[PDB]
Paper text:
Influenza virus neuraminidase (NA) is an important target for protective antibodies and therapeutic drugs against influenza viruses. NA cleaves off host sialic acids, aiding the release of newly formed virions from infected cells. NA is a mushroom-shaped type II homotetrameric protein. The polypeptide chain of the NA monomeric head folds into six, topologically identical, four-stranded, antiparallel β-sheets which are arranged like the blades of a propeller.
N1/19 hybrid means loops 01 and 23 of N1/2019 grafted to mSN1 (H5N1/2021) scaffold. Similarly, 16 dissimilar residues within Loops 01 and 23 of N1/19 were transferred to mS N1 scaffold to form N1/19 hybrid. The N1/09 hybrid showed an 8°C improvement in its melting temperature Tm to 64.4°C compared to the N1/09 protein (56.4°C), while the Tm of the N1/19 hybrid (72.4°C) surpassed the H5N1 mSN1 scaffold donor (68.7°C). The CD6 epitope was lost on seasonal H1N1 viruses isolated after 2015 (unpublished observation) so CD6 bound to cells infected with N1/09 but not N1/19 virus, but CD6 bound to the N1/19 hybrid protein strongly, suggesting that CD6’s binding to the N1/19 hybrid depended on the scaffold residues donated by the msN1 protein, and that the N1/19 hybrid protein had formed a compact tetramer compatible with the N1/19 hybrid’s higher Tm of 72.4°C. Similarly, NmAb-03, displaying specific binding to N1/19 NA on infected cells, exclusively bound to the N1/19 hybrid protein. To assess whether loop grafting influenced the local or overall structure of the NA, we determined high resolution crystal structures of mSN1, the N1/09 hybrid, and the N1/19 hybrid. Overlay analysis revealed that N1/09 hybrid and N1/19 hybrid were nearly identical in structure to mSN1, with overall RMSDs of <0.25 Å across equivalent Cα atoms upon overlay. In contrast, the N1/09 and N1/19 hybrids show no noticeable differences between the protomer cavities, all of which closely resemble the wider msN1(ii) conformation, apart from minor, local widening of the rim induced by the substitution of Y344 with an asparagine residue (shown as light-green sticks). Additionally, we observed that the Y344N substitution in the N1/09 and N1/19 hybrids slightly widened the enzymatic cavity compared to msN1. The mSN1 and the N1/19 hybrid both induced strong inhibitory antibodies to themselves, but the sera to mSN1 failed to cross-inhibit the enzyme activity of N1/19-like virus and the N1/19 hybrid protein did not generate a cross-inhibitory NAI antibody response to mSN1.
Author numbering:
A (entry chain A), B (entry chain B), C (entry chain A), D (entry chain B): 65 to 74, 79 to 469
The structure:
C-alpha cells in the first residue's frame, strides 16, 4: 500500500475518467468564461488565434488554440499566409486568459488539432505536413506516442475540438478527401496515445468534418459539419468497439451556417444551402436536441441555444426554448462542445458545456488579419438568462492603417 | 489512515476555516501591500480595473478585481462603455502585483462580484446578464455550482468585497431594486458553492449596497453603503442560521461619502447628504468602532482610520484615535474589509485588515479612462504610523492626448 | 509518524537552518548570476530598481529589490521622486531573471528592507512611513508578525541585504539617527517573525549603516558602512544572545568608497575620506579578510575581491590575491554578502557568496532615471578567473531624449 | 520505509536515468516542436538567442539557449558585441515557447554551454571569462558544484548541446586550442556536478568542436564538428570509464557545412572544403547512420535527414532514405541531438530526437542583429512525412530601418 501510494503521489492523475454517466438534466446555460482576447491584444502581446476549443483535466479547464506564431498588431498577423502553413502550432492556456506567449503552453505543431484528458494525462493530436501527405502526431503527456498518416492524400483533418474519453480510451474522428464531395471518414480509439483501433465509416452521401464529440453513458456522440450538401448537421455515434450508427439531425431548426430559413427538415442531408458550413455542436437528450447555432442564416453572426424536445428524430421546425448567446449584429464563428466529467465536478452525471469563437477581421472586416476571442457556457438545472456577450474589439487596429 | 491521508495529499485544503474566534485586539494598522498598478501600467500591460478587493486562502492572499478586458494606455480603456457590460470579467492576481493578463487568473464573467475561501476551495460569485434579469453564477473551485437570478428585475448586485466563511458555510448579501430608494436585500448561506439558505430582510427605510462582511465569533457582520438617504453606514449582522439584526452606525463620525461635517449622529439613516455614497467598511469592537473613511466629505479624496470607543451605540461625534492612510489631496475610492483567519496566521483570533482603492481618471481628472490601484493594511497590536500612500501616477497618459 | 509526516508534506520547509558550520575554505570566486536587467529593460517591461540583494531558501535563491513602481523607459522612472517615497516597494524574483512585474513577487511596502529564510519560511522586513516615525513591518511567510517603530525619529533604516539566520532565529541590524554623525544602532533577534530580543549597542564614535551580516559557526558577523567618519568598514559580531563585540577592519586595503589610496590602516575609523560611503561587505577568515570593494577610490566604479591574510587585525596595506570582478571604467555600486547553507548545498560548511549592484543613470550619466542591474559570485575552492562583467546598457535611453 | 518515502516526497527525482538501453528502431522523424521565436519577437519581448539546444528531465523537455541579454527589435540586439561577451547568459524555457524574460529561467553566465538531467537534478555547464583563461562553472540543481579552467589558454569551449547521462554520471567534451588547427580535446565524467574523471584524448590530426553526445547501451557517442580540415564529421565514443575510440563518419554523404558535393568519402578527415563547419549530429545505427545535414553545401540553408544503411563504415555516397526537414531556400543553422530516456517515455529503448536552429540576420541578411528560432523532431517507427518548417520571419525588422 505504502509503495503504490507513494508512487501515485510522486500532475499526472491516478484514475481514468469512467465516462459511464449520462448528460446532466439542464434547463439553460450559465456563462463560464470570456477571455476578451482581441480587446486585450490591441495593446498586449496576444496571439492571433483560431479555433479556441476548451477541454478539462482533473485540476482545470484549458483553452487550446491554433496560432501562426504571430501577435495581434504585429506585421506578421498579415493574412497573406495559408491556413495550413508550417508555422501553425497548437498551444493552450488557462480558460478565460488572453492567449499570450507568456501564458500559453506549447502543445504541438499543427494546422488541424484535437486534445482531451483521460483523467491521467493530456492526449494531444496535431496534424502537420503537406496537403498530399499530412501526418497527425499523437502525444500523450507531452511525449510523442503515435502517428497517423493521410490515407487519401487530400488534407487529413480532424475535430478542432476536444476528443472524447471513456474508461481509459479516447476517441476522435478524422476526414481525408475533398471538402466539397464524398470523402473518407475514420473513427480512432486511442489508449495512452497509442492508436489501438480505427474504422473507416461506410457513409455514402454523408460528409463529416470538424466533429464535436462528447461521451454519454459509455458511448460517444459526434455532431459534425456537412460541408458538401448539408445544411443540417450530421452525427455519428459509436461504442467503445467502434460499432457505429450515423444520421443527420432531423429538426427543421437547421444547425449549420449558411442554411435556409427554418422549415420542415430531413433526417438526411438538407441540400438547400448545404455547401460550406461552420464547425458546430449539438447535445442529444433522448429524442430532443440542444442546438447551438448562429442567428444569421447567411453569415457567422450571432448565436443561440435552442431546445427542441423532438428535434433529434422529427422534421418539424418547432421548438420550446431559445436562449440568446450572441446578438444578431455581432460576430460569432466556430462553436464546440466540451464536457466536465463527474470526476472533476463531483456530480453524478456528465456536465455539458460549449464554447463559441468570436471571429474578428477578414473576410468580413477591413483588416489585414483574422482572429477570434472566446466565450463559453455550461448547462445547469437552475436559473439562467439570455444576453449578448460579443467580442467587443474596436476595429480596425493600428496595424491595419 | 494511510488511504485517507494520501487522498488528502493528492491546492485543495483539508479543514474548513472555523470562524469561531473574535477579532484580534489592535491599536493601529500596519501597511500590508501596495501594487502601484497605474504607475506600472503607464508602460506595462496592465488591466484597467475597478474594485480590487482582497481575500485570502490557506496559502496566499489574492486581489480580485473587475476589468473590461482593456489595458491602460490602450484605446479600449475608453470610458464610453457601460459599467455593466458583457466584457466585464472578475479576475485575480497575487496581492501587491500589478493586475496583468500575464499574471491574472480568470475567475468569472461579472460586473458585480464576490469571492472568499472556506479553507478548502475558492468560492466566487459573478453577476452578469441584463439589468432586468441578471444572474449570479456561483463557482466553487472554479466549477459552476449554482445560479442566483434577479428577483426584483432591477440590477442584481453584490458585495464587491470578500464574502465571509464560518464553519464550512460562506455568507454574502445581495441587493435588487433601485439605488435611490427602497430596494430588496437578501442574505445567502452557501455551502460548497450551493445556496443552502437565503432570507429576504424586512428592511423598511434601510438601503444596503456593497456590503463589507467579515466573520466574528461565529456570526457575520456586514457594514454597507446607504445610497438612498444615509450618510452613516448601515449594518446587518446574522448568525449561521440567517437570524439577523440591523441598524446604522450611531457615531457622529459619519462614515459614508458624501457626508456632512461631523456632528451629533443617529442610529438610523442620517438624511443630510445621505444620497449616493461609496463602498466602505467598519469593524465593530464591542460598543466601539474602527471606521475607515475618506477625509473629504464631498469627494473621494484621502483616507483615515478612526477609533471611536463608543461609536457603535452612541451618537456623539467624539473619538480618540485617528491614523492617517491617504492624504487629503490624494484620490481614494472604494474600501473594503478582509480578514486573515487563525488557520492562516497561527494567531488565536480573527485578524482584521482592509484595502483601499485609489481611483484615477474620470470623472475627476482629464482622461478618457478610469482605473484604480490598491493599498492594504492589517490591524496589529504593536507600533504603527500614519502617512499618505497615494496612487502616484502622473496623469494624463499618452492615450489621453 | 504517519500523522506528523503527512502534516509536514502538506513550500514551507520542515527543519530550520542550523547555522553552526564555519565558512567554507575558498581560493576564489565563481560567477553565479547576471540578470542584464537594464539591457533587457531597454525594450521589455522591467522595474527601475535599487539594492538587488540575494537570499536563498531551501529550493532557490531570489533577488530582492526596491522599486518605485516604475518601469524603465517609462515617464515615471523620472528621478524627481524622493528615495523614501510612499511608492517604494520591496519585491523579489528568481536570481538572474530581469526584475519584471510579470515575474516579481510582492514582498512589502518599503524604502529600506531586509529579507532572509530560516529554513521554514521567508522573513521579510520592510520600513515605510515618515522620516520622523518610520515603521518596519515584519512578515513571516508573508503574514505580518511584528512591527518595529523608529526610536530616534531620524530615518529608521536597515541592511539592504539579507538578514542572518541561525538555529531558528534570524538577526538584523537597524540604525536610527543622522547619517553624518553619532547615531543609534540596534541588533534584533527575531523568531517566526516575532522580535524576541533587541539590544542598543553602546558604540560611541562608531557609525553603522547598511550592514552585510552572515552566519558563521553559530555567531553572526556584520560588516557595515561608516557614513560619518570612516573609510574602512565597521564590523559588529554577536552570538545568539546579542552579546556583541565591535571594531573596524584594520587592513590598509580600505574597503569603503570614497576612500584614500591604500596606506597604513587603523582598527578604528579611518577619518581620511571617511564621510559618505557605499554599502559593502567582507568575509572574516581567521585574522584575514576577503574584501570586496570598488576599484576607483572616488567613484562607485569597478569592483575587486582582495584576500588579505592578516587584514582583520593588522594595519598594513599588503595583501596576497586580487581577483577582478568589474573593470575600473565600468559602473558598480552597492555590494552585499549572502550565504548558501549546508542544508541547501549538501556541503559541511557555510558557503560565502556576494552580489554587486551595477548602477546606471543619475547622478553620473545624462538620464532622467537611476537603476541597477545585478551580478553575483560564490566562493569556491577550485579554479577561478578575474574578468569584468559590467552592466552593458547603452545610455541614454529613449525616455531621456 | 515511511521515513525514506516522505524524504523522497519532500522537483528533485528519486532514480537516476539508467542509460542502459539502445536506440529505438525508427523509420522516420515526427515533428516535436516549433517555437516561432523570431516571428513572435517581432512584437513581443523575446530574447535574441543562439544555439537553442533541447534537453529533458523526468517531467518536461526544455530549450536551453545563449542570449546577450538583449531583446529582438531593441537597440541592444546590435551585433556590434563579441560573441564571447560578459553579457552572454545561458537560460532555458519550455520547449516550443518563445524565449522571453517572462518565461525563461536563468541557468548560468556563459558564452559556451552544456546541460543535461541525470534523472535527479539538472546539471548545467557554463563557460565565461577571458579567452586566455575561461572557466566553466558547473552547477548541479542550480548550486555551483565545480569549476573547470582552460588548460591551453585558447577559448575553452564545449558542446552547445546536451551532455549525456548514464547511471548517475554525466559526460561532456571540451575543446581548448585553435579553431583552425590542432587543438586539445578532453572528456569529462561528472557526478552530482563534481568532476570525478577526465581524459585528454590523443587525437593527432583530428579536430573536435561542438559535440552532439547521446547515450546508447551504456556508452556515449559524440558526433562533432571538424573546423580544421574536415567536411565529414568526427566522432568519439567512450564507456563510463573514459576508454575511448575515435574516427570520422565514413559515408560519402558528407555531414558538415561547408562541404563538397557527395562523392567517395573517407574514414579520416575529408580535407576538401574541410575548414570551418557547423554544429551538427548523427545517430549510429549499427554500421549505418542517420545523418542530419544542411541541403546547401556552401551556406547554412535547408535541412534533411538521410538514412545511410552502411554510412558509418563504408565510403560510398549511396543512401536509401531522405526525409525533408527544411527547404533548400530557407535558412537553417546549428543542429543537435537530444534523447528521451525510457524513464520518461515508458519505452524500452533510448528515443533519438534532434533540434534545428534556424538563423535569421547577419551575415546573410540585411539586419543589425542575428538570432535563431527552433524546430525539433523525434524519431519514430511509424508513418512520417517530409516538408519544410522554416523560420518564417519577414526581415528586416523595425530596428533595422
Ligand atoms: C461508473 O463507474 C464508476 C466506477 O466503477 C462508479 O463509481 C463507483 O461506484 C461504486 C458502486 O456504487 C461505489 O461504491 C464507488 O465508490 C464508486 N467509485 C469508484 C471510484 O469506484 C460510478 O458510480 C458509475 N457511474 C454510474 C453507474 O452512473
Ligand atoms: C550542526 O548541527 C546539526 C544538527 O544537530 C548537525 O547535523 C547532525 O549531526 C549528527 C551528528 O553528527 C548526524 O548524525 C545527523 O545526521 C546530522 N543531521 C541532523 C539533521 O541532525 C551538524 O553536523 C552540525 N554541524 C557541525 C557540527 O559542523
Ligand atoms: C494505495 O495503493 C493500494 C494498493 O497498493 C490501493 O488499493 C489504494 O487505493 C491506494 N490508495 C490511494 C491511491 O489513495
Ligand atoms: C520507499 O522506501 C523504500 C525503503 O527504503 C524503498 O525501497 C522504495 O523505493 C521507496 N519508494 C517507494 C515508492 O516505495
Ligand atoms: C501585408 O502584405 C502585403 C503583401 O502581401 C503588403 O503589401 C502589406 O504592406 C502588408 N501589410 C502590413 C501591415 O505589413
Ligand atoms: C473499462 O475499464 C475496466 C477497468 O480498467 C476494464 O477492465 C474494461 O475492459 C474496460 N472496458 C469496458 C468496455 O468497460
Ligand atoms: C475553534 O474551534 C477549533 C476546532 O474545534 C478549536 O481548536 C479552537 O480552539 C476554537 N477557537 C476558539 C477561539 O474557541
Ligand atoms: C473615445 O471615444 C470617443 C467617443 O466615441 C471618441 O471620439 C474618441 O476618439 C475615443 N478616444 C480614443 C483615444 O480612442
Ligand atoms: C515523521 O514524524 C516523526 C515523528 O512523528 C519524525 O521522527 C520523523 O522524522 C518524520 N519524518 C520526516 C519528517 O521525514
Ligand atoms: C489522516 O487520516 C486520519 C484518519 O482518517 C485523520 O484523522 C487525519 O486527520 C488525517 N490527516 C493527518 C495529517 O493525519
Ligand atoms: C521629468 O520631470 C521634469 C520635472 O520634474 C519634467 O520637466 C520632465 O519633462 C520630466 N521628464 C520626462 C521624460 O517625463
Ligand atoms: C538551538 O536549537 C535547539 C533545538 O531546537 C534549541 O533547543 C536550542 O535552544 C537552540 N539554541 C542554541 C543556542 O543552540
Ligand atoms: C536497465 O536497468 C534497469 C534497472 O536495473 C532494468 O530494469 C532495465 O530493464 C534495464 N534495461 C535494459 C534494456 O536492459
Ligand atoms: C548599431 O551599431 C552601430 C555601430 O556602433 C551604430 O552606428 C548603429 O547606429 C547601431 N544601430 C542601432 C539601431 O542601434
Ligand atoms: Ca453545410
Ligand atoms: Ca421540433
Ligand atoms: Ca450615502
Ligand atoms: Ca464617540
Ligand atoms: Ca565612509
Ligand atoms: Ca595585510
Ligand atoms: Ca568542416
Ligand atoms: Ca552508403
Amino acid at each position: 500500500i505504502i509503495n503504490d501510494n507513494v508512487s501515485t503521489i510522486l500532475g499526472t492523475g491516478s484514475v481514468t475518467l469512467a465516462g459511464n454517466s449520462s448528460l446532466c438534466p439542464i434547463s439553460g446555460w450559465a456563462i463560464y468564461s470570456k477571455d476578451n482576447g482581441i480587446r486585450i491584444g490591441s495593446k498586449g502581446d496576444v496571439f492571433v488565434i483560431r479555433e479556441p476549443f476548451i477541454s478539462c483535466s482533473h485540476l482545470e479547464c484549458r483553452t487550446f488554440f491554433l496560432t501562426q506564431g504571430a501577435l495581434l498588431n504585429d506585421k506578421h498577423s498579415n493574412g497573406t499566409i495559408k491556413d495550413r502553413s508550417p508555422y501553425r502550432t497548437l498551444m493552450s492556456c488557462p480558460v478565460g486568459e488572453a492567449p499570450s506567449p507568456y501564458n500559453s503552453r506549447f502543445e504541438s505543431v499543427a494546422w488541424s488539432a484535437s486534445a482531451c484528458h483521460d483523467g491521467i494525462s493530456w492526449l494531444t493530436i496535431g496534424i502537420s505536413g503537406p496537403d498530399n501527405g499530412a501526418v497527425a502526431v499523437v502525444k500523450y503527456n507531452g511525449i510523442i506516442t503515435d502517428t497517423i498518416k493521410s490515407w487519401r492524400n487530400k488534407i487529413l483533418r480532424t475535430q478542432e475540438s476536444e476528443c472524447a474519453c471513456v474508461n481509459g480510451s479516447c476517441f476522435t474522428v478524422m476526414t481525408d478527401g475533398p471538402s466539397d464531395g464524398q470523402a473518407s471518414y475514420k473513427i480512432f480509439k486511442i489508449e495512452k496515445g497509442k492508436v489501438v483501433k480505427s474504422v473507416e465509416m461506410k457513409a455514402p452521401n454523408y460528409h463529416y468534418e470538424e466533429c464535436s464529440c462528447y461521451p454519454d453513458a459509455g458511448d460517444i456522440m459526434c455532431v459534425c459539419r456537412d460541408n458538401w450538401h448539408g445544411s443540417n448537421r450530421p452525427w455519428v455515434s459509436f461504442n467503445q468497439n467502434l460499432e457505429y450508427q450515423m444520421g443527420y439531425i432531423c429538426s427543421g431548426v437547421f444547425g449549420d451556417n449558411p442554411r435556409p430559413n427554418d422549415k420542415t427538415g430531413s433526417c438526411g442531408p438538407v441540400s438547400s444551402n448545404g455547401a460550406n458550413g461552420v464547425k458546430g455542436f449539438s447535445f442529444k437528450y433522448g429524442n430532443g436536441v440542444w442546438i447551438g447555432r448562429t442567428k444569421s442564416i447567411s453569415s457567422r453572426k450571432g448565436f443561440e441555444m435552442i431546445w427542441d424536445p423532438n428535434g433529434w428524430t422529427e422534421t418539424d421546425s418547432s421548438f420550446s426554448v431559445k436562449q440568446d448567446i450572441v446578438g444578431i449584429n455581432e460576430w460569432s464563428g466556430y462553436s464546440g462542445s466540451f464536457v466536465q466529467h463527474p470526476e472533476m465536478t463531483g456530480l453524478d452525471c456528465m456536465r455539458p458545456c460549449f464554447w463559441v469563437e468570436l471571429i474578428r477581421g477578414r473576410p468580413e472586416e477591413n483588416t489585414i488579419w483574422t482572429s477570434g476571442s472566446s466565450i463559453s457556457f455550461c448547462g445547469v438545472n437552475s436559473d439562467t438568462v439570455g444576453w449578448s456577450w460579443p467580442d467587443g474589439a474596436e476595429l480596425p487596429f493600428t496595424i491595419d492603417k
